[PDB]
Amino acid sequence: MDFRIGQGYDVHQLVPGRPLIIGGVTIPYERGLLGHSDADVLLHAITDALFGAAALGDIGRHFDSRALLRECASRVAQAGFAIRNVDSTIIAQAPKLAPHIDAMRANIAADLDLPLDRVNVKAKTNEKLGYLGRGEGIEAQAAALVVR
Amino acid sequence: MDFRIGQGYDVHQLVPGRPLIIGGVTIPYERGLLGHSDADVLLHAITDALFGAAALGDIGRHFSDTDPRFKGADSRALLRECASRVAQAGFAIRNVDSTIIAQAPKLAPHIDAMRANIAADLDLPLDRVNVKAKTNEKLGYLGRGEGIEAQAAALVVR
Amino acid sequence: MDFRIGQGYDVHQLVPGRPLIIGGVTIPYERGLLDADVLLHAITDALFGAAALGDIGRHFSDTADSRALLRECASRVAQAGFAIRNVDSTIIAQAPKLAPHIDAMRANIAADLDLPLDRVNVKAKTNEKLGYLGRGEGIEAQAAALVVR
Ligand SMILES: CCOC(=O)c1sc2nccn2c1C
Ligand SMILES: CCOC(=O)c1sc2nccn2c1C
Ligand SMILES: CCOC(=O)c1sc2nccn2c1C
Ligand SMILES: [Cl-]
Ligand SMILES: [K+]
Ligand SMILES: [Zn+2]
Ligand SMILES: [Zn+2]
Ligand SMILES: [Zn+2]
């Protein structure tokens, strides 16, 4: 049928005195992500991928990050699209994200009204390269498939 | 239902004395993108996603950067030729999505025009083409405005 | 029907002293990746991602070369109920020239995934002398995969 794909990218600086919140999960860490919102880099990337797949523009032209993700899903449905799946990658040199992946997936699935088997989150370091490798920021990438 | 996906990446240095042309739009700006062609980073990314979805290789294979015939080339002409070869290979384009990442200038005012150019070149309606603009949150060579990056995704069907 | 998309990313440092293996192909160069097959890793991640099976680190704990890992990945994706429809990818390396080796990489990947050659694509890019990629300090790979349940 009328399938569409979307792709999303986000990055935020890591700064002192902020909670680290990724995929809705508060992760123990001495620094957190800097932004106007709670700076949830993963949710932002997914949001952009979903807007992209529905050809609805981007997060900047539309607008915590879970409320924003829920609103994104609403606007995607309003345009006549159903979400089929989401995949994503977080790139962070530190801290370890593996123990938190399942909770992120559950959060995203709940926000998008999707079963768990249609949401994926993957974790990577940057092999100590560049600003990500120096722990100056955290990047997220996302892909979304929808159908009209 | 023989769907295929493709993805594209491009980056170019931002330098004085070149036109800034992104998504086919000439943007008023003191610097422009450096390349053999008009260096349209967004159109190149989309071109690569389309060739990739059709398993036809990449922009270098089809349009050589060492070939003088492409010096200052209009990247919309390249995108249209790509679309023609994708069609010849038996594929129809279903949608395109993309991201441009730049510290400056502001791209929001130009996005609709880029979308319209890409839609024209691909013979798509506007509602199957998307362009997203952002900054790199001050990080890295993108944060320092040394270059501009584009990412693209395309869905086709044979 | 029940299509899903997946995406993958990988990067490795590029220094003298190790061989350069990308897409199962050994490429002569003064530097190598710290088998560190960046392209196969990205594709593996995209496949696990499309199947919503997590990632390469969850399946294959560092606690076998990258082609063996790719083959096992494909087996798990199949058992989870998914057929692979296509793979596309990009390698970003300032040097050496990767174009001569593309068909060899595609052949290795198609073999490992039991796919027709025309459903596997690999693209090559430089980083226009920008960043650690542009300075030849590492090589990046990006991948996209489409599957169907
Ligand atoms: C205002 C809250 O949402 C937004 O518009 C967002 S989310 C986001 N991530 C990097 C920049 N950015 C902006 C401007
Ligand atoms: C010259 C038109 O097509 C090409 O070959 C292109 S487009 C392009 N963008 C960055 C490098 N590059 C090359 C080598
Ligand atoms: C055992 C092979 O799989 C892995 O865990 C991999 S693949 C890989 N590429 C960069 C880091 N990295 C790790 C930790
Ligand atoms: Cl920036
Ligand atoms: K990148
Ligand atoms: Zn953000
Ligand atoms: Zn280019
Ligand atoms: Zn790797």
Whether B126 sits inside 8 A of A11 (CB atoms) is: no
Q: Which two tokens stand for residue B116?
A: 């319209």
Contacting residues of A for C48, CB less than 8 Å apart: 120, 122
Domains of chain A with CATH codes: 1-148 (3.30.1330.50)
Element (H, E) at B52: helix B41-53
- The CA distance from B130 to B123, in Å, is 14
From which experimental method does this structure derive?
X-ray
Contact, C50 vs C105, CB < 8 A? no
Total length of chain B: 158
Q: Which two tokens stand for residue B129?
A: 């083409």
Contact, B148 vs B114, CB < 8 A? no
Q: Which two tokens stand for residue C124?
A: 């090559």
Name, in order, each residue with C-beta under 8 angstroms of A142's C-beta and a sequence gap of 6 or more: A6, A7, A8, A9, A42, A45, A46, A48, A49, A86, A87, A88, A89, C7
3-state SS of chain C?
A: CCEEEEEEEEEEEEECCCCEEECCEEECCCCEECCCCHHHHHHHHHHHHHCCCCCHHHHCCCCCCHHHHHHHHHHHHHHCCCEEEEEEEEEECCCCCCHHHHHHHHHHHHHHHCCCHHHECCEEECCCCCHHHHCCCEEEEEEEEEEEC
CA–chain centroid gap for A122, Å, is 11
Least distant ligand from the CA of B143: 4
- The CA distance from C115 to A53, in Å, is 27
C-alpha closest to that of B13 among B148, B140, B151: B148
Contact, C102 vs C122, CB < 8 A? yes
Q: Which two tokens stand for residue B152?
A: 């693209």
SS3 A85: strand
Contact, B146 vs B11, CB < 8 A? no
User: After which residues do gaps appear in chain A, with C to N over 2.5 Å?
Assistant: 63
Contacting residues of A for C132, CB less than 8 Å apart: 129-130
- The CA distance from B44 to A38, in Å, is 34
Contact, A90 vs A121, CB < 8 A? yes
Question: E strands within A3-121?
Answer: 3-16, 20-22, 25-27, 31-33, 82-91
Compute the nearest-CA separation of B140 from chain A (Å): 6
* Bond prior to A115 in cis (omega within 30° of 0): no
- The CA distance from B47 to B110, in Å, is 20
Interval between CA B49 and ligand 4 midpoint (Å)? 25
SS3 B129: strand
Contact, A4 vs A84, CB < 8 A? no
Resolution of the model in angstroms = 1.7
* Bond prior to B105 in cis (omega within 30° of 0): yes
Q: Which two tokens stand for residue A39?
A: 């700076």
Q: How far is CA C18 from CA A147, C37, C71, in A?
A: 46, 12, 24
SS3 A146: strand
- The CA distance from B96 to B126, in Å, is 10
List alpha helices for A59-100, DSSP H: 59-62, 65-78
- The CA distance from C55 to A7, in Å, is 18
A20-22 vs A25-27, strand pairing mode: antiparallel
Whether A89 sits inside 8 A of C13 (CB atoms) is: no
Q: Which two tokens stand for residue A41?
A: 């880099």
* φ/ψ (deg, to 5) at B37: -85, -160
Whether A126 sits inside 8 A of C54 (CB atoms) is: no
**Minimum CA–CA partner of B147 in chain C:** C130
C-alpha closest to that of B46 among B132, B146, B137: B132
C-alpha closest to that of C45 among B50, B4, A90: A90
Interval between CA C37 and ligand 8 midpoint (Å)? 6
CB under 5 Å of ion ligand 7: residues: B 10, 44
- The CA distance from C52 to A105, in Å, is 10
Element (H, E) at A101: helix A101-111
Name, in order, each residue with C-beta under 8 angstroms of C83's C-beta and a sequence gap of 6 or more: C147, C148
User: After which residues do gaps appear in chain C, with C to N over 2.5 Å?
Assistant: 34, 63
> Residues 58-117, chain B: which have Cβ within 8 Å of A?
94-95, 97-99, 101, 108, 111
C93 known ligand binder: yes
Say whether residue C2 is in contact with chain B using an 8 A CB cutoff.
no
Element (H, E) at B118: helix B111-121
Q: How far is CA C7 from CA A19, A21, A84, B34, in A?
A: 28, 22, 15, 29
